[PDB]
Structure 1
């Protein structure tokens, strides 16, 4: 019946993630599903630092590569079919969405 259900969204580009989140919020509040707003988990940053040079010669310069990971959650209180439906729609770009059974 009515269940708690949490959707977790992850990506590296922020604008796609935020627009996806706001559209899911729209589609949820057009059915009056009592949505708990997006919670923004801390961003993660992966750092990799290497010598620039192929061989061992030169003054000793380094690169500082890093990749960022954004992650947020939204919570719904509703039956499963509507949420697995609207979830299945309105995602064009590269963004990760994972929806689970219950989280409360």
Structure 2
């Protein structure tokens, strides 16, 4: 409630993010053709380092 008056309500905004995982052994110039292949706003993919 934007005020303090009511009858004691409590809403539960819950946000649930999922995650998956994939290994590679590959050289990392063609890591660039892993990235730029979907525009896709609904993904958050991350690039792990290729120093090994």
Q: Is the TM-score greater than 0.5?
A: yes
RMSD: 2.1
After TM superposition, what 4+ stretches of structure 1 lie above 6 angstroms from structure 2? none
Number of residue-to-residue matches in the alignment: 52
The unaligned stretches of length 5 or more in structure 1 are 1-52
* Inter-partner Cα distance in structure 1 for 2:2 and 2:51: 50
Question: TM-score normalised to the size of structure 1?
Answer: 0.42
* Inter-partner Cα distance in structure 2 for 1:84 and 1:76: 13
User: Bigger relative contact order, structure 1 or 2, given CA contacts below 8 A and separation 6+?
Assistant: 1
Higher normalized strand content (fraction of residues): 1
SS of the counterpart of 2:12? strand
Q: Residues 21-78 of structure 1, C-alpha deviation per residue, up to 9 Å, x if partnerless? A: xxxxxxxxxxxxxxxxxxxxxxxxxxxxxxxx22122211111111111111111111
Question: TM-score normalised to the size of structure 2?
Answer: 0.70
